[PDB]
Each structure stands twice: as C-alpha cells, then as structure tokens.
Point group: D2
Chain length 47, copies 4
C-alpha cells in the first residue's frame, strides 16, 4: 500500500535486479542504493 515515490523507487530497483541478475544480490543492491543517494546528494549540495 506504499506511497507513490516508494513504489517508483522499488519498481526501478526491481527492474535493475531483473536486468542485471547479479551473482552477488546484496553487493549489487547496496551499490545501487548508495548510488541513488549519491545522485540526490549532488542536487542537495548544488548552489
């Protein structure tokens, strides 16, 4: 029953998992979420 933004981020993640089918699910998933944060951090740091 999640909010729309949460469903969108979960759908993007599920799409990435199905496209890559990582041999190390946890490492791929941690790298993915740490990169999504990194992307939003660039907006937050900007002048």
């Amino acid at each position: 029953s999640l909010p729309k933004e949460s469903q969108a981020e979960l759908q993007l993640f599920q799409n990435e998992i199905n496209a890559a089918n990582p041999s190390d699910f946890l490492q791929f998933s941690a790298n993915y979420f740490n990169k999504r944060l990194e992307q939003q951090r660039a907006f937050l740091k900007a002048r």
Copy 2:
C-alpha cells in the same frame, strides 16, 4: 535465483513493515547492514 528471490522478499517485507519516510536512506542502510551481517560470518 532462489537466494536472490529470498533476499528481495526479505527487503520488500522490511519496506512494507516500516514504510520509510526516506525510502533511499532506509534501503541503503538495510543493504549495508545485510553486508555487515554476512561479513561477520565470512571473516
């Protein structure tokens, strides 16, 4: 794979149980902690 489906089901269960205010931060914290838990076993 079955291990991937299990880890994805565990994550989806955590998201539905917590319904985080910051989805990205909760998800990064979750996966970093799952790695930390497996590191203890692997060392």
Copy 3:
C-alpha cells in the same frame, strides 16, 4: 572542510580502535552522509 572531516574521522578511529577498521570506517562515512542529507533536504 576536508581537513576537518578527515580530523573527525581520525579522532573516531583513535577513540573507538575498531577490531574491524573497514566496517567501522564504511559505517562512519555512510552515517556522515546520512546526517548531511537530512540537513541539506
């Protein structure tokens, strides 16, 4: 700012003396990012 964040990190390493340096350091920096994200948002 970089020297101050490096000094804070070195101080944390010397105060905690972790048995797992890499895990402590990754947790530390991931938490510093988490803290800054809240303030920036």
Copy 4:
C-alpha cells in the same frame, strides 16, 4: 593495529591523490569498495 594503520595510510594516500570535490561521498565510496573487494576474497 598494523592492518588498521595500513588501511588508514591507504585512505589518506587516496585522499591526497584524488583531492575529491566531495570528501564524504568519496570516502564512503572508498570504504564501501574496500569492503566489496574483501567480500570477493572471503567468498572465494
């Protein structure tokens, strides 16, 4: 400890070699990657 001093010296060397625009993001990425590298060795 010797292993901790070596990892701290490697990190300080990386900071001086890259001089990152975003110190915190570079440092988090660095330690997360050092863990990733050790995970591959531990799983082998």
